[PDB]
Amino acid sequence: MAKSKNHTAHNQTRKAHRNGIKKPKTYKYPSLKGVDAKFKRNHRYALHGTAKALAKARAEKSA
RNA sequence: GCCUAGACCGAGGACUGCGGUUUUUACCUAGGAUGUUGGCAUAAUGAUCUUAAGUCGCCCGUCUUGAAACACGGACCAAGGAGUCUAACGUCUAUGCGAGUGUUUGGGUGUAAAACCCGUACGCGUAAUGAAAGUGAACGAAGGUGGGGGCCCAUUAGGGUGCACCAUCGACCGAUCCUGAUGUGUUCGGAUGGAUUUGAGUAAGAGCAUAGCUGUUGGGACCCGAAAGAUGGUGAACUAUGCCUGAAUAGGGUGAAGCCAGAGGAAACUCUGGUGGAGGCUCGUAGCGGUUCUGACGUGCAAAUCGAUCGUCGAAUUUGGGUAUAGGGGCGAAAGACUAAUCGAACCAUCUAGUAGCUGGUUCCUGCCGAAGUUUCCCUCAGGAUAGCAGAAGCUCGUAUCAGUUUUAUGAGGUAAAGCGAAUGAUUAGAAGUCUUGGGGUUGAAAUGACCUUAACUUAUUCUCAAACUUUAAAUAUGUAAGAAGUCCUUGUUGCUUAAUUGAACGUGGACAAUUGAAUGAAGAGCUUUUAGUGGGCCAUUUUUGGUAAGCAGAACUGGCGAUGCGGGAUGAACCGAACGUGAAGUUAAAGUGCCGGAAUGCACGCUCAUCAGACACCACAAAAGGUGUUAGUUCAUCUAGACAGCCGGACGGUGGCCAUGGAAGUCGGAAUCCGCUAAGGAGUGUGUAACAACUCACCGGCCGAAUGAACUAGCCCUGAAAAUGGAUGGCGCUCAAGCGUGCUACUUAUACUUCACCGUGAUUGCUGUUUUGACGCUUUCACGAGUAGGCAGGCGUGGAGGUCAGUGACGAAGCCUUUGCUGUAAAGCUGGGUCGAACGGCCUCUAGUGCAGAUCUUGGUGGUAGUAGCAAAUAUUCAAAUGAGAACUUUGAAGACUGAAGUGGGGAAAGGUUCCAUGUCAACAGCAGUUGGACAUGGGUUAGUCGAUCCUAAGAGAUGGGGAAGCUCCGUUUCAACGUGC
RNA sequence: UGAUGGUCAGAAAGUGAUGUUGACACAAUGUGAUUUCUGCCCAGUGCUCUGAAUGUCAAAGUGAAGAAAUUCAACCAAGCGCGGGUAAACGGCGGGAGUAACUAUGACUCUCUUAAGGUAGCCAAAUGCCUCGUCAUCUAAUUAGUGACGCGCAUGAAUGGAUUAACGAGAUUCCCACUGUCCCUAUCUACUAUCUAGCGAAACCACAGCCAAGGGAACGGGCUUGGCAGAAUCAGCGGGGAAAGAAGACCCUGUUGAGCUUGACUCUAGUUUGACAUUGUGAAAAG
RNA sequence: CCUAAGGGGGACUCAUGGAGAACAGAAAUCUCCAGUAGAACAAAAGGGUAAAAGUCCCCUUGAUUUUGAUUUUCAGUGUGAAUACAAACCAUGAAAGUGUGGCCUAUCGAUCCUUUAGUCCCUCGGAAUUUGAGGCUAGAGGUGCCAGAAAAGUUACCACAGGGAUAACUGGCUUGUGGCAGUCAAGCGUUCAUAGCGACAUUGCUUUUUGAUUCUUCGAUGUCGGCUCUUCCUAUCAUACCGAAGCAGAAUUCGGUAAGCGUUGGAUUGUUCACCCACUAAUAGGGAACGUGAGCUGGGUUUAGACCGUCGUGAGACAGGUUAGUUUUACCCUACUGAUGAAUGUUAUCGCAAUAGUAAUUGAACUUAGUACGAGAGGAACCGUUCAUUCAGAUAAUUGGUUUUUGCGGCUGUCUGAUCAGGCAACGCCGCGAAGCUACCAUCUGCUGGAUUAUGGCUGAACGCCUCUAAGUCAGAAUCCAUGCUAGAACG
RNA sequence: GGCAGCUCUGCUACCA
Numbered sequence A: 001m002a003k004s005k006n007h008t009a010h011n012q013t014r015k016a017h018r019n020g021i022k023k024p025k026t027y028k029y030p031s032l033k034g035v036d037a038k039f040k041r042n043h044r045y046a047l048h049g050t051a052k053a054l055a056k057a058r059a060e061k062s063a
Numbered sequence B: 001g002c003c004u005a006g007a008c009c010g011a012g013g014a015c016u017g018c019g020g021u022u023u024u025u026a027c028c029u030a031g032g033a034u035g036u037u038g039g040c041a042u043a044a045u046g047a048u049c050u051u052a053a054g055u056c057g058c059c060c061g062u063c064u065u066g067a068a069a070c071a072c073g074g075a076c077c078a079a080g081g082a083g084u085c086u087a088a089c090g091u092c093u094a095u096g097c098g099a100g101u102g103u104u105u106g107g108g109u110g111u112a113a114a115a116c117c118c119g120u121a122c123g124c125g126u127a128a129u130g131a132a133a134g135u136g137a138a139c140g141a142a143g144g145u146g147g148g149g150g151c152c153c154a155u156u157a158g159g160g161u162g163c164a165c166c167a168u169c170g171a172c173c174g175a176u177c178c179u180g181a182u183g184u185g186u187u188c189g190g191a192u193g194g195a196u197u198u199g200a201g202u203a204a205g206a207g208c209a210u211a212g213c214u215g216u217u218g219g220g221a222c223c224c225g226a227a228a229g230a231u232g233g234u235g236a237a238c239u240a241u242g243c244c245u246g247a248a249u250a251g252g253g254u255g256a257a258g259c260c261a262g263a264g265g266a267a268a269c270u271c272u273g274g275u276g277g278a279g280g281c282u283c284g285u286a287g288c289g290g291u292u293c294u295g296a297c298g299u300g301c302a303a304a305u306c307g308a309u310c311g312u313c314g315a316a317u318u319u320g321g322g323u324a325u326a327g328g329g330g331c332g333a334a335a336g337a338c339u340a341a342u343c344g345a346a347c348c349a350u351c352u353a354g355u356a357g358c359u360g361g362u363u364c365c366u367g368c369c370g371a372a373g374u375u376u377c378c379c380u381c382a383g384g385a386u387a388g389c390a391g392a393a394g395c396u397c398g399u400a401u402c403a404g405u406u407u408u409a410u411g412a413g414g415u416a417a418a419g420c421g422a423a424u425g426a427u428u429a430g431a432a433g434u435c436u437u438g439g440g441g442u443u444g445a446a447a448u449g450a451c452c453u454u455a456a457c458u459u460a461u462u463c464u465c466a467a468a469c470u471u472u473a474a475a476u477a478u479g480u481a482a483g484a485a486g487u488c489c490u491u492g493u494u495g496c497u498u499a500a501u502u503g504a505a506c507g508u509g510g511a512c513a514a515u516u517g518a519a520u521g522a523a524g525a526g527c528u529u530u531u532a533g534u535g536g537g538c539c540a541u542u543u544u545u546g547g548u549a550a551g552c553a554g555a556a557c558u559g560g561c562g563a564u565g566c567g568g569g570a571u572g573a574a575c576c577g578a579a580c581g582u583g584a585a586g587u588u589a590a591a592g593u594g595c596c597g598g599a600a601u602g603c604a605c606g607c608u609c610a611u612c613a614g615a616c617a618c619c620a621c622a623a624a625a626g627g628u629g630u631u632a633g634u635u636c637a638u639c640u641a642g643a644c645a646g647c648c649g650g651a652c653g654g655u656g657g658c659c660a661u662g663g664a665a666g667u668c669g670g671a672a673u674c675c676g677c678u679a680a681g682g683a684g685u686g687u688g689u690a691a692c693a694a695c696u697c698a699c700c701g702g703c704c705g706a707a708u709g710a711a712c713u714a715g716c717c718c719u720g721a722a723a724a725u726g727g728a729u730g731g732c733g734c735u736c737a738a739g740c741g742u743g744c745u746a747c748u749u750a751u752a753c754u755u756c757a758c759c760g761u762g763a764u765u766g767c768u769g770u771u772u773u774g775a776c777g778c779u780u781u782c783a784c785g786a787g788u789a790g791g792c793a794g795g796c797g798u799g800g801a802g803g804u805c806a807g808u809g810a811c812g813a814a815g816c817c818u819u820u821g822c823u824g825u826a827a828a829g830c831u832g833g834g835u836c837g838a839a840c841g842g843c844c845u846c847u848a849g850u851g852c853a854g855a856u857c858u859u860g861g862u863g864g865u866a867g868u869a870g871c872a873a874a875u876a877u878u879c880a881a882a883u884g885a886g887a888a889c890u891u892u893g894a895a896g897a898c899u900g901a902a903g904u905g906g907g908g909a910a911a912g913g914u915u916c917c918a919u920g921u922c923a924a925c926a927g928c929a930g931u932u933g934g935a936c937a938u939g940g941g942u943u944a945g946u947c948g949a950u951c952c953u954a955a956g957a958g959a960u961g962g963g964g965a966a967g968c969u970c971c972g973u974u975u976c977a978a979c980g981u982g983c
Numbered sequence C: 001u002g003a004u005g006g007u008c009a010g011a012a013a014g015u016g017a018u019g020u021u022g023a024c025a026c027a028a029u030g031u032g033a034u035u036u037c038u039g040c041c042c043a044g045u046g047c048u049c050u051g052a053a054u055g056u057c058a059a060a061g062u063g064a065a066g067a068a069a070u071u072c073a074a075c076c077a078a079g080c081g082c083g084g085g086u087a088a089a090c091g092g093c094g095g096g097a098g099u100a101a102c103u104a105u106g107a108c109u110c111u112c113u114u115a116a117g118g119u120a121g122c123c124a125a126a127u128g129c130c131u132c133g134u135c136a137u138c139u140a141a142u143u144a145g146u147g148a149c150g151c152g153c154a155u156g157a158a159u160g161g162a163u164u165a166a167c168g169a170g171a172u173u174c175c176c177a178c179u180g181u182c183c184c185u186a187u188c189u190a191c192u193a194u195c196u197a198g199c200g201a202a203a204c205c206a207c208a209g210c211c212a213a214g215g216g217a218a219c220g221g222g223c224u225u226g227g228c229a230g231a232a233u234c235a236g237c238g239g240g241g242a243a244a245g246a247a248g249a250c251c252c253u254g255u256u257g258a259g260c261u262u263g264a265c266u267c268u269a270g271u272u273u274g275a276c277a278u279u280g281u282g283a284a285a286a287g
Numbered sequence D: 001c002c003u004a005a006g007g008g009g010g011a012c013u014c015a016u017g018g019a020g021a022a023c024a025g026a027a028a029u030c031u032c033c034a035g036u037a038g039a040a041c042a043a044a045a046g047g048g049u050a051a052a053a054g055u056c057c058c059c060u061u062g063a064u065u066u067u068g069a070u071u072u073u074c075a076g077u078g079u080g081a082a083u084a085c086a087a088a089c090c091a092u093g094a095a096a097g098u099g100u101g102g103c104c105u106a107u108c109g110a111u112c113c114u115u116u117a118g119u120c121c122c123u124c125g126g127a128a129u130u131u132g133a134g135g136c137u138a139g140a141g142g143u144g145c146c147a148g149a150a151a152a153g154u155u156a157c158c159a160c161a162g163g164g165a166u167a168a169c170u171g172g173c174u175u176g177u178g179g180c181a182g183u184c185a186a187g188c189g190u191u192c193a194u195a196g197c198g199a200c201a202u203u204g205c206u207u208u209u210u211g212a213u214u215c216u217u218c219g220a221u222g223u224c225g226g227c228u229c230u231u232c233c234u235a236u237c238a239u240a241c242c243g244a245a246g247c248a249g250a251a252u253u254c255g256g257u258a259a260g261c262g263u264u265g266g267a268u269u270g271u272u273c274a275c276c277c278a279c280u281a282a283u284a285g286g287g288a289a290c291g292u293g294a295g296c297u298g299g300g301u302u303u304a305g306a307c308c309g310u311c312g313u314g315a316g317a318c319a320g321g322u323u324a325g326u327u328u329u330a331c332c333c334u335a336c337u338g339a340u341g342a343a344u345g346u347u348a349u350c351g352c353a354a355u356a357g358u359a360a361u362u363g364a365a366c367u368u369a370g371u372a373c374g375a376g377a378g379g380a381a382c383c384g385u386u387c388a389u390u391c392a393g394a395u396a397a398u399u400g401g402u403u404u405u406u407g408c409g410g411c412u413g414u415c416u417g418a419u420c421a422g423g424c425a426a427c428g429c430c431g432c433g434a435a436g437c438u439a440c441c442a443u444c445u446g447c448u449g450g451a452u453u454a455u456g457g458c459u460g461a462a463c464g465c466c467u468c469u470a471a472g473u474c475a476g477a478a479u480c481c482a483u484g485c486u487a488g489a490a491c492g
Numbered sequence E: 001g002g003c004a005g006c007u008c009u010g011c012u013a014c015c016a
């Protein structure tokens, strides 16, 4: 009495290709989410020290 | 290179350009048609209306995969008729002010619901976070890195600065967890430093208010629609049942008790004849009922009747009036029956516009874009939410680095195929070995020690298989890469890592410049918000599952239909071709070219003849098996040392060898079988004798001479081949086709392609010292145009409002009718003529009860049907006169009839209410008529001490004293009463 | 059910029906004249009966702990549970093998098992599937009728069994009579229909109205291809208009109902049981 | 399901086969050799595993704590499950290491409420103390319809909104099944495959069976059967003409052209179907919306009443039996059957014939003839003759039926005073009754040519023969077309 | 899930 269509993938690639299928954008810096915490913890200290060294190097060349 | 025939078109509107010839600051064919002539202007020309001809054209709206449907609504017309308003909101936009913002609760004021003015509070915002106690946002130029429009310096490039914004690493505030300083109401405090944790935060505020569209929720909620539910009332004039008081019921039959007489008997008792008049007895009227014809009728005489037939007919009978019982109630000799045409829960009003995931409807035009039937969840499966698909608004930028594609490089796979003397599983046949750990038999007097056999295993082989087997293993499809965010050199940071000076990650500085590292393309890339419809699908090729199959059910990929017209397939949602603005010319696609029908009875090679031919994919059917029909092949074989066929000789022998016994020289029949001259043939092939015969042989002869036989293959045709109205290669018809196979030339024509005109959309060129009273404008160029549901835009029309035209109008507003026309793609606007009589319009804005073909829509009106169905029960009318305009129907007379005293007579109860009577009178009514009437009009008319009511009480109804009940009111009827308006 | 009652009514009442009543009565049911009979089962579900002792067991009350709220414990009514009765209460009333000097059957025996295992009767019956059972009768022929039979799907005793004179607009079979029911139709009468004068509706209606085939929502009036096709019409007729009448009453769906039932879920009038209050005055005895 | 079947470490090698050892054997235990796993690993199946993941031994609790990230299903939500780390604390091992349950792929659960653990922290808001209560973080108690309401029936008294999204007819696709027909040819048939049959197989047709499906119809297409009537099909029962036989005759069987023509009366049953009786030339099968209900009927089915049996506690059910149960409308269009009719200068008479329709059918008796044939038993046919069946078209002499001839007569009741003569009895009744109508209940009439089918032939090639055929040709069926019969085109 | 008697019968109770 209520037997209908069960499943069909007909027309699904047509709909996917109207506005897709879009590749994700790439960025210079990926997010570090999921990267090892021990590496991420230390990587914070390495970047902080790098900024200090560059700041001092420029501070030498200013006054 | 040259000559030559025809057709269609003429956009643009001073000049500017590119070229050419230069005889030249000139001319040209070179950035789009001019010249000339005739005719006509009472007309050649154009438009519309009507009609004919040719061709095409199914009925709209609706739900649907699919509608012209034998699906639903729609007889017709007019007027009305359906997304509204409000509270609170999301996005976006406009506006004012802006770390603020909002005057309008209120006060002041007023030309008085207006306008104008005022301010405290309060709301929202400016701070978050935690359940809370509580705590509460700068290490730094409010941080670093990579981009980033613009600006600055430059001078391709390059450098500086870089807002918004993007990615990323940090910092700060709150919560959570860890650590725990000086100290202390010794249990508090919480400094300091941390943590793959967490917040709708900070990190130089952005909000508030008003308005508009769209979307949301609650409200009647786009309009119309339940079956139901509740509250409060009204009914027992029908009917059901009880009660009270009345009334009604021919004529027969039968013949119970009791009684009288006679007869018999010892008694107990018996018999006979009368009489009598019983009975929920019986025949049968009135009455009450309602069996059958399943009669009539069945838009009726009638929302239950009519006729005949029938049940019952002295009681559980029939019936009037009074009275009681009332809706989850009554009443029921019980059928869920009856309770006013209403009953498995009456009627009335209200709650109530009840709710509906369901059906129906949903009103102007054009332009642009344009779907889904799929994912997940849901008492979900006719519904929603969610994601997707779609529109709109845009925003940041301007070739940055993207793609339903290829190439090159490099991965993954276990399907097709293949395999099985490869694993697993299935499976056919032999062969060789061992049985010593198989039986039977035969050896053995007994030795388990041989042999014959089958069956087992073993070995090397053999035939055939697998979706849930496999060593191997495609095609198609699929992942990644092809640089500047790259490569190389040097050396900075860390608490991570190393034995380390090693690495990891991120960096400073330097080098490699457009061949910056494959192709092809790119109406540009990126980003955001918000919202519609949809969430039944179906079809075709190929893959594929279930099923005998199905126009069946279920999947995969793609393309379609839905949502889509156009040319072809006669016809047809989907097939082939091709997708669509309005046109002109040319050419085609698919399909065709005998006629219907535009284009060949065209050119060509063959095949086929059907006493059911055949005739074009999807597709509208035919098979196995057959044919000395005909055609073409293949392989054998015989052939001029005369093939097959036919006319004509022979085939003598050894030997009549043998057996069957009627006889075998083959021949009722049988095993068999050697030798002499021939161009030739045997102890014999059929025919023939019971037999010897004799013929032909099996061969070779003569006669013309040249082809012949067998098996097989596949073309067309034929057999196989049977269905129901007459009938379909679409029809006619077609036979060296107008059929079948194949080739060729030309030709025909789609909304397709090419060139051109015009419309619109998108983009694009330029336009201010000539911008010049339109820059929301003008202008250059190119591309494009299908569309249901749906979105958006620009317009048309209607009622009313502010403003304006010092607008139109009684010398004619508005309305209405009309081949009077004009304008617009259109919605529509304007106008000529006629009619008409008092108001009305244009423009800029505001506002809404604003647009109809549908809703078995509402109300009103009108058709076809159609002068049709019909006006046929109750026996029946006729002549004359009178009256009158008029006589089937009135009156009177004469006649003929009927009811036939249980009447068609004479009165009454209920109910009606003037219908009664006289006079006048015919518009309507009396389903014909009408002089008549219960019609219409004017008058008149009902007389009581004795006839009724009035009085009595009946079943019952109902005050009081009282007692309940919130109360409307309920009980009770002399009741727990000091009860006389006493005589 | 003996009235301080049974059955029933009312919101309540100093309220009602039966009841102007009293077991030969009132109330509640079942079966359904007469005749002959009404067998077995009290395990189930009901109904009913006692409670000397007794599991569960509410509120109030009692005792203990606690600062109290509170908690815990004992006691603890009816009901239920326990025990008995009751079938003219609701109802129920069995299977498997062997066996007799042929065969068949099974008087008889064995075996499982119940509360009891269908008794007297009756039957292919209005109750029997198989089934049109088998035999007889009725007929030329009988799925009908009647009489028998009975391992009876699934007969059976006041959920009444078996009969039964009389009665029946009840259902059925046969026979006589009778006939147009029929062979097989014909004829006649009145009223219609018909025609006229007068009068004059309604249903229904997208547009309409000739066929055959095709395709098509798979049965066309319309479309395609054919056949064809000539005004205006009257009486009849019932092939078609998938004719009209009614938003299918069958079926399914809906998170739509309603009537009815019960051991559905959730309650409830009534009734019953306890406590407190109304509620006072004495005596005695047990705690 | 598992305190190991989790975790770590170590040692060993499994299934099975062969050869050997007292009882001991096919299977006890021991030994050696071979042994790629042919074993085992809790449980389905697949993958995985050999100094192991298997077997045995030793030690253990990492099946622990904190909170993030990720994969699958996915909306990139939840739940389940899993992965890689961070920070602890541990187990094990010499150690490197490994371990966040089970070698991997399944083995599970929100809000509200309750309860426990933790922090012993926050709150009970006029201020405190102690009980009590409420919060915060993590488990547990559960929804199996497993993203998670709290839930029994019946309706044959029924209602509403809808649905052809969906069943009960027809129709359409299909044709398994039903029915019918072929091909091959092992056998049957005294012999002998094919006169007649025909196994094992195999190819079809049909839509007269029943399924399968669910395309149409649920704002309705009237659902059984019979009666009535017309038509069509052929897969032919009879009738015409023929071919074949295991055809002597008679009968019968097989087959061809053939649907022209017929195919019945009854008992029982609602029946379709069936089954008997009987006649007959034969009693063939089907279709037309399973033809046919505004044609009927209404026995059946299938509303509501009622009974029984079985089932159910019950209301009730039964596709079981039984009895009673409203069958509506045509006047429209078309079509059919008949009937008029304008205009084809008027009117009249007589005609022609396009086209359409069509009609006859079957039997018996006599004769042939007791003949052919046959041993006999039996036993035909053609020519012919007389009748009959079914049908058709007329007709009314006769006979019968019918009577409003109300024609004549008769009869009852009543009315007109009697008589005569009449009236009435919703034609009063009866007998006869002409005329008209009418009946196989009566009588009459129902034609002869051509062309063919099957088939049998002639001449005659192909194919020097043969051959009914290929060219040509003969006869020939109830067939066809005419003749004859009916209408006459209203636009011949 | 509470009582109680003989691994258990009876009664009573029920917000995930």
Ligand SMILES: [Mg+2]
Pocket: A004, A005
């Ligand atoms: Mg679906």
Ligand SMILES: [Mg+2]
Pocket: B012
């Ligand atoms: Mg021009």
Ligand SMILES: [Mg+2]
Pocket: none
């Ligand atoms: Mg056309």
Ligand SMILES: [Mg+2]
Pocket: B062, B063, B072
């Ligand atoms: Mg619709």
Ligand SMILES: [Mg+2]
Pocket: none
């Ligand atoms: Mg449909």
Ligand SMILES: [Mg+2]
Pocket: B067
């Ligand atoms: Mg339509």
Ligand SMILES: [Mg+2]
Pocket: B069, B070
């Ligand atoms: Mg149709």
Ligand SMILES: [Mg+2]
Pocket: B071
């Ligand atoms: Mg319909």
Ligand SMILES: [Mg+2]
Pocket: B072
């Ligand atoms: Mg509908």
Ligand SMILES: [Mg+2]
Pocket: none
């Ligand atoms: Mg209609």
Ligand SMILES: [Mg+2]
Pocket: none
């Ligand atoms: Mg209007």
Ligand SMILES: [Mg+2]
Pocket: none
């Ligand atoms: Mg604030």
Ligand SMILES: [Mg+2]
Pocket: none
């Ligand atoms: Mg706070």
Ligand SMILES: [Mg+2]
Pocket: none
């Ligand atoms: Mg900020």
Ligand SMILES: [Mg+2]
Pocket: none
């Ligand atoms: Mg309503």
Ligand SMILES: [Mg+2]
Pocket: B229
């Ligand atoms: Mg309700």
